Design a protein around this nucleic acid. Sequence first.
RNA 1: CGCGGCUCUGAUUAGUGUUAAGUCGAAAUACGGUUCGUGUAGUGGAAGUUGCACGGGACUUAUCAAUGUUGAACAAUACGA
RNA 2: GACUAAUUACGUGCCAGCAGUCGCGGCAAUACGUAAGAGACUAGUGUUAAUCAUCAUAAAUAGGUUUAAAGGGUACUCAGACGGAAAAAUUCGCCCAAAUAUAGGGGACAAUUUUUCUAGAGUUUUAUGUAAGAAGGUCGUACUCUAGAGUGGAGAGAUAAAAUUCUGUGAUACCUAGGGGACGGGUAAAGGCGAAGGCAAUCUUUUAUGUAAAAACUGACGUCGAAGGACGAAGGCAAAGGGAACAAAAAGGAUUAGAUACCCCAGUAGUCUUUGCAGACAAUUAUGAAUGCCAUAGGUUAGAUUUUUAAUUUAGUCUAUAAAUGAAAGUGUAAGCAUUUCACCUCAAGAGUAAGGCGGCAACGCAGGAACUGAAAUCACUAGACCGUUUCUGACACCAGCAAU
RNA 3: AUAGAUGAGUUUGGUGAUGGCUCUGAUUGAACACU
Lengths: 33, 88, 218, 128, 160
Amino acid sequence: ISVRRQKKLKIKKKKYKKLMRRTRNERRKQDRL
Amino acid sequence: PNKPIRLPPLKQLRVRQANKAEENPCIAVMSSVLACWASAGYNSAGCATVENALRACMDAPKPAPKPNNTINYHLSRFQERLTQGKSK
Amino acid sequence: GKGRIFQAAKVYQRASEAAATNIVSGLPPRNPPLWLKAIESIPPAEINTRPYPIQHSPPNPRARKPRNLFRPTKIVYPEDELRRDFYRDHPWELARPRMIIELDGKDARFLDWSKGLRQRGIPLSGESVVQRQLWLMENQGMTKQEAYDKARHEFYKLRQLEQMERRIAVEEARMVGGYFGKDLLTVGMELENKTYESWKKWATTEIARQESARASMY
Amino acid sequence: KDRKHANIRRCIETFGRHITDQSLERPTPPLARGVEPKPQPVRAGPDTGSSEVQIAILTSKIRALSKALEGHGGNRDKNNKRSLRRLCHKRQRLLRYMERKERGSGRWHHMLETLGLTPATWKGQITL
Amino acid sequence: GIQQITNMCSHLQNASRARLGLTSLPNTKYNLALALALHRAGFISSITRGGPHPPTPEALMTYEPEPVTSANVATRRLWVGLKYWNEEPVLKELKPISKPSRLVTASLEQLNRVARGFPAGYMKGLQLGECLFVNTDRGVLEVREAVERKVGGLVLCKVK
RNA sequence: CGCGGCUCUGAUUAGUGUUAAGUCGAAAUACGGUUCGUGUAGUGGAAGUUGCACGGGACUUAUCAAUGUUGAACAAUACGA
RNA sequence: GACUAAUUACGUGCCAGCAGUCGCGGCAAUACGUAAGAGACUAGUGUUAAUCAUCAUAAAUAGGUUUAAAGGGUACUCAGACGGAAAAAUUCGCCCAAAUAUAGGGGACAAUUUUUCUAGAGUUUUAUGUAAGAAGGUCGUACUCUAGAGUGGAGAGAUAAAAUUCUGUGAUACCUAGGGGACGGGUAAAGGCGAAGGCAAUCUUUUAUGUAAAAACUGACGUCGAAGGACGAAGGCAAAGGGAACAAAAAGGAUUAGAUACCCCAGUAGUCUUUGCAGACAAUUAUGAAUGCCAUAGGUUAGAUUUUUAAUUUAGUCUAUAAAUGAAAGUGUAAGCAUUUCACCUCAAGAGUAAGGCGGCAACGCAGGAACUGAAAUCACUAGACCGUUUCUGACACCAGCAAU
RNA sequence: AUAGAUGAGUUUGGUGAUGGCUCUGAUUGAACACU
Ligand SMILES: [K+]
Ligand SMILES: [K+]
Ligand SMILES: [K+]
Ligand SMILES: [K+]
Ligand SMILES: [K+]
Ligand SMILES: [K+]
Ligand SMILES: [K+]
Ligand SMILES: [K+]
Ligand SMILES: [K+]
Ligand SMILES: [K+]
Ligand SMILES: [Mg+2]
Ligand SMILES: [Mg+2]
Ligand SMILES: [Mg+2]
Ligand SMILES: [Mg+2]
Ligand SMILES: [Mg+2]
Ligand SMILES: [Mg+2]
Ligand SMILES: [Mg+2]
Ligand SMILES: [Mg+2]
Ligand SMILES: [Mg+2]
Ligand SMILES: [Mg+2]
Ligand SMILES: [Mg+2]
Ligand SMILES: [Mg+2]
Ligand SMILES: [Mg+2]
Ligand SMILES: [Mg+2]
Ligand SMILES: [Mg+2]
Ligand SMILES: [Mg+2]
Ligand SMILES: [Mg+2]
Ligand SMILES: [Mg+2]
Ligand SMILES: [Mg+2]
Ligand SMILES: [Mg+2]
Ligand SMILES: [Mg+2]
Ligand SMILES: [Mg+2]
Ligand SMILES: [Mg+2]
Ligand SMILES: [Mg+2]
Ligand SMILES: [Mg+2]
Ligand SMILES: [Mg+2]
Ligand SMILES: [Mg+2]
Ligand SMILES: [Mg+2]
Ligand SMILES: [Mg+2]
Ligand SMILES: [Mg+2]
Ligand SMILES: [Mg+2]
Ligand SMILES: [Mg+2]
Ligand SMILES: [Mg+2]
Ligand SMILES: [Mg+2]
Ligand SMILES: [Mg+2]
Ligand SMILES: [Mg+2]
Ligand SMILES: [Mg+2]
Ligand SMILES: [Mg+2]
Ligand SMILES: [Mg+2]
Ligand SMILES: [Mg+2]
Ligand SMILES: [Mg+2]
Ligand SMILES: [Mg+2]
Ligand SMILES: [Mg+2]
Ligand SMILES: [Mg+2]
Ligand SMILES: [Mg+2]
């Protein structure tokens, strides 16, 4: 996989990684960690 | 100690500067003039012989260019024989 | 593939078929090339078929998985061992020029080593000693050292007379008014003069160069 | 290292097939149906390749290594943890083959009781 | 084992691809059977078992090999004489059909159909020049030699 | 009647897809103007950015201060661009 | 319109509409809507839906995974597949050969088993060589802290330039005497060692493989290997130490239109030690492991043989090629010819995401979809152009000079 | 049972590949529209 197509996966993992952090307390309340 | 390697196949075996690069002579003479001014002084007496030497170069005519060194021609002949070969 | 598809071995096959029939169906085929019938009964030889090369020395019988089976072997004769021994005992025998330019190749037809070192067509050199040595060692059942001594000693006596003739030749020649040119000794010294003088010039220049280069250190 | 090569001599002199052919009562395995014994050439040298000798030598190596991993700071040596699992497995393949090859020979029981090689050493999977 | 025949088939391809005059093969009862078949069909020049070094080429057929006892059975080896004609090898391809992972067997009714350019089972029809060797109780015969003898069995290799 | 499963729905809230003509930056592709990606841990409206090790899918893109030779005279019926 | 047999005219003007796919329509449209003609099937003709085939497009027959979807981080190993030589017993597998064939024949091959063999795999003979690993101790260059009512007496350090900053409570600079932590200069190489991850100062202690040469020994004891278990970089979590240096974070000073940044003054976790958790990596040779095999050359690493000068030779490693192979780039001890076995792939996007579940202190890991929306995504090469790319070459393009706006 | 194995359009500035989509063939206990 070229670097150009690896950057499309790079922006998918960052947004998800950043999403789990943001919504970590919300998932801790509902016991969904 | 190992011996020199066998060069890989190159596009062209040659030397960039076939003929030596001649440095302007009195550029060094100017350095001496500047040096004396620093230590002795601008309006001094020991700088006469040094300053006069700088005026001597500009008046003198520049030497003529040397004959080209035909070294790249012979390197191209023995390229395929010396190295692994030619690439293209 | 940097190579190209060569078909030089099938020129007859390809050409013969092309000349079988005409391109205009319904006509007699035109006459073929003039060379088609010349090499009709001379097919090309087989190429590119690695055979078992000739074994000039017994192959290693212990090797269970031998390599380089299709590689030509080195040619070694019994003389090689003797030549190495002699020429190592007489290193200055190599300064004697020896011509390896064969005239007609028929030089081994008049060589009979039973007579002596002197032979027809070949000069007196280390080779004659080796061949003579080998002969005595084989025919006369002598040892390597014994045969070496005998033949070697004959070589000396023949060389002694050769050197004696030179001195006696020039000496006797002058007794009757015979003058010669510059000997090799004198000529050699002259060339050194021309070369030594050139070294003096270079030395003087570089010496002066360093002196001028030493003024800049201070 | 000096002991390592001194114990190998003890294993070749104790379990060597060239010494157990007379010390043991029934060294060879029992003959099969119809098979009749025949004379064979003598061994030119000492028997050092038999499974008994190999299994004995592996046992000496396993003890030295296993004894070095239980000493001070032995857990930190996590790279030789595979060396022990490779000797026990290498010994399992010789015991598993020597079992069915000897099929109860006196030469096979003398090694077990002497070295203490219990059935866990080869019957299943050695998990470490 | 069938793995030997597969190794033998692959080797003869490489040896012919390298345009070699001689070729060595491990001396086995199986390899010899297929070698005699290739020779009986006209693919290889000669067959002679010898040591790790090839016999005297000039006296290949006159070469008298020594007895094969247990003292030298490990060094014996079959020496095959490859054949080349018209700047082209005679044993170009030796694709195998019965591999160690699966032993493909053919019947007489299927071999009759394969010997005329018609597929049958896990095989394909034979075209001009192609040849198929089948290992039966009558030895390693050719598909057309097994059809006249009315037998079948293990299919070794397809020779083109 | 209890327990578990399953279906629909749920204030509130999240992600993603499509949509030429909006906005804010200019991150990547050239040494892309801070080498770029991998893992991991932080950080910032966003693209981004920082630490630590790692990969080349980036530097083999490499091209003389060894400066390059009176290597056996001359003359002859030998030799003769 | 082309695929797909068969044409013009007018109207409309990215509007109305056609469309299975690519597409057509913006004022002279062969594609839309009328008119005529033409091509074709015909009591049927088209369209929609579905099925097979197309599709080797889940490939048993019969695929593939370096750069395009796809090799597991690793190899010891249970199950399970597969695997030597020469004979023999049994099954009668396999074949004649069927009709799910009674009863027989044939013996190459196959299954279980027996007896022998040494070519695979191993053991012994302290190899040589070697940054695999681990324990207990030390060495040194620099750095840093304290002390000297040290010498010296106003600057120093930083940066493209500065600022914040250090200094008269005596700094930088040059020394003396102690203390304290982690680091590994040269050697050093296309070098080497381990299953990989990874391993480079030094002494002792301790550990498994591997390589060379000869003999001897066991006698197929072999290869791969789901799972389980073990190991696994940096970072991270937990506890107790350590704390010189470096440095996420937090914070300050500049730059800038703005500056989170890049740069700078400083600086906490952390890096280190011990005991556990964690298991993700461009964990790469973008190439699983192993076996059989195919022509040469030049280096190089550790040995061996020899007429040890220099050549043969075993096991590795790296360049350049032949045959060949490949989409090509290229490889050419393999990305070739074959084989064994395991893992993995089946258009893009959504997505390595959701839900349930397992593991974990947590971070997160394993495993793993569908809906909605598309006709394309994707790889190598070729020729150009561009480059705050290299080296050049022409031009009042520029330098310089004069004049002018 | 021995005649039975077939392609086309579409990615790119362009070429060769990879890989889907669609058409070409046959059919239905079919429906619908015009007849
Ligand atoms: K960047
Ligand atoms: K910050
Ligand atoms: K198009
Ligand atoms: K991976
Ligand atoms: K002080
Ligand atoms: K596993
Ligand atoms: K700031
Ligand atoms: K080599
Ligand atoms: K989802
Ligand atoms: K101008
Ligand atoms: Mg990929
Ligand atoms: Mg440690
Ligand atoms: Mg709701
Ligand atoms: Mg940028
Ligand atoms: Mg950049
Ligand atoms: Mg980075
Ligand atoms: Mg780049
Ligand atoms: Mg490059
Ligand atoms: Mg048409
Ligand atoms: Mg219409
Ligand atoms: Mg129309
Ligand atoms: Mg009808
Ligand atoms: Mg891998
Ligand atoms: Mg894993
Ligand atoms: Mg089997
Ligand atoms: Mg029978
Ligand atoms: Mg039978
Ligand atoms: Mg023996
Ligand atoms: Mg062996
Ligand atoms: Mg040693
Ligand atoms: Mg050893
Ligand atoms: Mg003082
Ligand atoms: Mg210290
Ligand atoms: Mg590494
Ligand atoms: Mg060092
Ligand atoms: Mg190694
Ligand atoms: Mg035996
Ligand atoms: Mg294994
Ligand atoms: Mg760690
Ligand atoms: Mg830690
Ligand atoms: Mg802590
Ligand atoms: Mg700092
Ligand atoms: Mg663990
Ligand atoms: Mg790594
Ligand atoms: Mg594996
Ligand atoms: Mg290396
Ligand atoms: Mg190469
Ligand atoms: Mg291939
Ligand atoms: Mg997908
Ligand atoms: Mg989940
Ligand atoms: Mg997964
Ligand atoms: Mg280009
Ligand atoms: Mg101007
Ligand atoms: Mg004006
Ligand atoms: Mg392009």
